[PDB]
Design an enzyme around this catalytic site. Structure first.
Site, PDB file in Angstrom:
ATOM      1  N   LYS A   9       0.811  -1.207   0.000  1.00 34.30           N
ATOM      2  CA  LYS A   9       0.000   0.000   0.000  1.00 34.30           C
ATOM      3  C   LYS A   9       0.848   1.262   0.000  1.00 34.30           C
ATOM      4  O   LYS A   9       2.027   1.252   0.396  1.00 34.30           O
ATOM      5  CB  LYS A   9      -0.979   0.002   1.176  1.00 34.30           C
ATOM      6  CG  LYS A   9      -0.335   0.145   2.543  1.00 34.30           C
ATOM      7  CD  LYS A   9      -0.653   1.509   3.132  1.00 34.30           C
ATOM      8  CE  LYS A   9      -0.625   1.486   4.667  1.00 34.30           C
ATOM      9  NZ  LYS A   9       0.610   2.124   5.185  1.00 34.30           N
ATOM     10  N   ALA A  96      11.216  -3.967   3.911  1.00 41.33           N
ATOM     11  CA  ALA A  96      11.388  -2.731   4.644  1.00 41.33           C
ATOM     12  C   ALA A  96      11.106  -1.557   3.714  1.00 41.33           C
ATOM     13  O   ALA A  96      11.709  -0.498   3.855  1.00 41.33           O
ATOM     14  CB  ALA A  96      12.802  -2.649   5.182  1.00 41.33           C
ATOM     15  N   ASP A 136      -2.227  -2.293   9.866  1.00 40.63           N
ATOM     16  CA  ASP A 136      -2.193  -2.276   8.401  1.00 40.63           C
ATOM     17  C   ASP A 136      -2.755  -3.550   7.760  1.00 40.63           C
ATOM     18  O   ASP A 136      -2.964  -3.612   6.546  1.00 40.63           O
ATOM     19  CB  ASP A 136      -0.769  -2.010   7.900  1.00 40.63           C
ATOM     20  CG  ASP A 136      -0.320  -0.577   8.164  1.00 40.63           C
ATOM     21  OD1 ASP A 136      -1.008   0.365   7.705  1.00 40.63           O
ATOM     22  OD2 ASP A 136       0.719  -0.395   8.832  1.00 40.63           O
TER      23      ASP A 136
END
Length: 298
Positions: A9, A96, A136
């Site tokens: 996202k 990451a 999330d």
């Protein structure tokens, strides 16, 4: 065997309330799922196991500290079973990368098992479990675009008339969210950093499927703080726009940059220019909105 495809996202809009106590910052954000994906394959096995492949995969833990592992345990417990499943994650969401790749994986595990075990609990139950894993995870289930107006709030679905085209660019090191919040607080004390407009016009541009209308509304109240910590972010953002992007912002606490472009053609051209310029570690093109976690092979 079941494989589930799930997107990373980007934050199109991120408003950050003034610091309260215990030092919490209220948020409202517009989440947008784009076509950088992980695919997770799940099979019945003798014992819970987890394996990842793809660029950064080497680095990630394959035990309980991996959200996907936690998801398998939560799903199993939810229905009174042992998590006797092998999980294989094919990552293309950069590690990451600030695109909630780990949350995407957890969402994908919930779906895969839901289907593999023929449980087929309602999607609403999956998102209930997703909220327990992390903030999330529910969006990685929901996909598309959504307005999130606060911590415990349900996601509001935003449908788009058209596809949008993105260039995503990633740095070689992250920026701690903690450190970015501290700098934003500091910037608000010594000065008056840019405050965003309202969420509504952003949703309206998304809904119109109009990149020219959306571009000036994209924004992140944490961007000023990230840029303060690394002035190079500001040059990368200008490079993308000079290359032809309509607009660029950092997504989240950074340092990941998202560039809205006019078309797939422009996105490729902008991405190639940024890639060549070497201002970032990795550059990818993508589109959104794309669906959330879904079975693609059974």
């Amino acid at each position: 065997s079941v494989t589930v495809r799930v997107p990373g996202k980007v934050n199109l809009y991120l408003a950050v309330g003034d610091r309260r106590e215990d030092g919490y910052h209220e948020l409202t954000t517009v989440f947008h799922a784009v076509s950088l994906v992980d695919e997770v394959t799940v099979r019945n096995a003798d014992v819970l196991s987890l394996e990842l492949v793809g660029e950064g995969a080497d680095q990630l833990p394959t035990d309980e500290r991996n959200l996907a592992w936690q998801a398998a345990e939560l799903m199993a417990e939810h229905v009174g079973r042992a998590p006797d499943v092998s999980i294989m994650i094919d990552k293309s969401i950069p590690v990451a990368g600030g695109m909630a790749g780990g949350s995407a994986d957890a969402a994908a595990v919930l779906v895969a098992m839901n289907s593999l075990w023929e449980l087929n609990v309602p999607r609403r139950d999956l998102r209930m479990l997703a909220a327990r894993l992390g903030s999330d995870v529910p969006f990685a289930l929901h996909g598309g675009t959504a307005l999130g107006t606060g911590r415990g709030e349900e996601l509001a679905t935003v449908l788009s008339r058209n596809t949008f085209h993105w260039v995503l660019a990633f740095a070689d090191s992250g920026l701690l969210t903690s450190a970015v919040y501290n700098e934003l607080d500091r910037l608000r004390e010594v000065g008056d950093p840019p405050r965003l407009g309202e969420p509504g016009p952003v949703l309206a541009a998304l809904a119109a499927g109009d990149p020219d209308q959306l571009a000036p509304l994209l924004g992140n109240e944490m961007q000023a703080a990230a840029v303060s910590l690394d002035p190079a972010l500001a040059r990368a953002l200008r490079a993308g726009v000079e290359a032809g992007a309509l607009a660029g912002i950092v997504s989240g606490s950074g340092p990941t940059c998202a560039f809205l472009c006019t078309s797939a053609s422009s996105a490729i051209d902008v991405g190639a220019q940024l890639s060549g310029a070497g201002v970032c570690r990795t550059v990818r093109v993508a589109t959104g909105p794309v669906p959330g976690a879904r079975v693609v092979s059974a």
